[PDB]
Ligand binder design. Structure first.
Ligand SMILES: O=C(O)CCC(=O)C(=O)O
Ligand SMILES: O=C(O)CCC(=O)C(=O)O
Ligand SMILES: [Fe+2]
Ligand SMILES: [Fe+2]
Lengths: 332, 332
């Protein structure tokens, strides 16, 4: 049930802003950072929303105006799409699937250019949608650097330490239009997801739901993304999608979602909620050291078998046929 | 068409002695050892019957009486079976498939004991069948050693040399009753198959017919044997068996069949042809050094993936499910 905003400013959102899907979900716990339960959750690689880390306290004031004035003159990656769905794809892998035709394009531009584009679409009542997604780097301005420095490094570093995680690989800045969706996928890094402006509905599925989510082949540009269209699931190709069960939540300014490595996540900017801003924190996972193996370990194994076959056969497209030959009449 | 025996002793066999199966076959070439064509065949790992190598010239006189008198007092492995089919199984792997119940048993005995058993069955009109299969070793007697030494090492060593093969790992002595069958399987060694007494129908299928022959899982005791019952093929489980095509031949005393590594072979002692004697020569293949990959290389790859998964998951029985999870909805 939607939380009330302090000061009797009313419900932060309502049901009508949520997209409707075919599967049930349970709530992800929202807890204080001081609550031992949060600590058990993270320890065990289960999601949790922290409500009070102050992780990006200084970024709460960010909006387009402030960012345009201060984020520098560096290039920003902007995806454009004709649907609300921004399926991620890896350009490096595009050669090996000539028949893949992306639904969204990436364009490099200056922050002011992005803002202007956002302005033009609004005014022209256009249907185009944009999603800025760009790693924060040295080109940003002084004030931003001040802000960034003002993040609660104290708290997150301890987190990195307690969990034996690896280094911070990056912080992605995501600014998106209301209604935008990042379709379900998994990332090979641990992620603290810091919501700053707007609200994002986050739907997660644990690693052991691999059978239900049908990730594209490792060598395909959509490696790590599910093949199922959540808007119109095709149960013939993907029958187990009828057994999927999610953990969901809505994060707002100030909240931090722990999205544990290998957990599937689907992320949507609320309908009619205005733009959203988020900053994630991606850490390399801890080192691979016991049976029984954990789901994510099995996932690792499967990935590796695909990669090995790819290399050994000399053509990733040969991977499927070999696997089929391997199991039909033998293991299926 | 059956060859005529020298001296107008008539046809060495006839069609009625051949078991009938569902698939077509073509003849394997019979050539003289001096014929360059044989040499191209072996070079290219394709079967050929050599008619004049004199490889086991001294063994041609062997029969049960001579062997009993001279083969020593060592133990001999004897398989017993209630069907004409002697499916091979690897006792080391029996633990991991508690539900496998072998159709034939192995019994260790003295050659004279084997002979006696053969005598008792005959006299008692029994239906039991035996197949002696035992590697030739030091315990054999003087005369046998003389014979063995009299093999055409000159010729076979050159063969080993020309093909860069590895060492002779062994020579199996196979003595079997008329009608006995070794069901189709593949061996990971190069094999010169030297027929000595009786006739054996040999049906071979090249490595690229893997999809048609459905080998048991690598960790199963029947690893390397086809799962299809050639006598009553189950096309629902094994639909591609309807596309299988063999190379066949009948070897007799003096002939040598080159059964190249990874080639499937099915071997049968002619109905009503009396006992058979054969000696094989197994060499480790040459070393693994280019695309496109050869069929047998793909077979190697598949074997290895199965072995790796086995070890990595800690339970071979977990191998199938993982593979199924890997491909369904993804590669199939
Ligand atoms: O917020 C989004 O739209 C995507 C974020 C995401 O997928 C991630 O941080 O892994
Ligand atoms: O002759 C037989 O029955 C079996 C021989 C065989 O399978 C082999 O030498 O690989
Ligand atoms: Fe992600
Ligand atoms: Fe064999």
């Amino acid at each position: 049930e939607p939380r009330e905003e302090a000061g009797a400013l009313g419900p932060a959102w309502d049901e009508s802003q949520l997209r409707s899907y075919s599967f049930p979900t349970r709530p992800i716990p929202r807890l204080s950072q001081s609550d031992p339960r949060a600590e058990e959750l993270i320890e065990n690689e289960e999601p949790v929303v922290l409500t009070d880390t102050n992780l990006v306290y200084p970024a709460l004031k960010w909006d387009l105006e402030y960012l345009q004035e201060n984020i520098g003159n560096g290039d920003f990656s902007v995806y454009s799409a004709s649907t609300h769905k921004f399926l991620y794809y890896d350009e490096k892998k595009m050669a090996n699937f000539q028949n893949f035709k992306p639904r969204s394009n990436r364009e490099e531009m200056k922050f002011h250019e992005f803002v202007e584009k956002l302005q033009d679409i609004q005014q022209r009542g256009g249907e185009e949608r944009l999603y800025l997604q760009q790693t924060l780097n040295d080109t940003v301005g002084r004030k931003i650097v001040m802000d960034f420095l003002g993040f609660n490094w104290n708290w997150i570093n301890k987190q990195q330490g307690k969990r034996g995680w690896g280094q911070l690989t990056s912080n992605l800045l995501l600014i998106g239009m209301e209604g935008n969706v990042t379709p379900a996928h998994y990332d090979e890094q641990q992620n603290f997801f810091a919501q700053i402006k707007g609200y994002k509905r986050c739907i997660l599925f644990p690693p052991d739901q691999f059978e239900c989510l049908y990730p594209y082949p490792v060598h395909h540009p959509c490696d790590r993304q599910s093949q199922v269209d959540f808007d119109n699931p095709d149960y013939e190709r993907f029958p187990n999608f009828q057994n999927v069960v999610g953990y969901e939540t809505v994060v707002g300014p100030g909240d931090v979602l722990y999205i544990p490595m290998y957990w599937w996540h689907h992320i949507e900017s609320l309908l009619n909620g205005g733009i959203t801003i988020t900053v994630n924190f991606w850490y390399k996972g801890a080192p691979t050291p016991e049976y029984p193996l954990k789901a994510h370990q099995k996932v690792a194994i499967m990935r590796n078998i695909e990669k090995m076959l790819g290399e050994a056969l000399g053509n990733p497209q040969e991977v499927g046929p070999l696997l089929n030959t391997m199991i039909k009449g033998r293991y299926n």
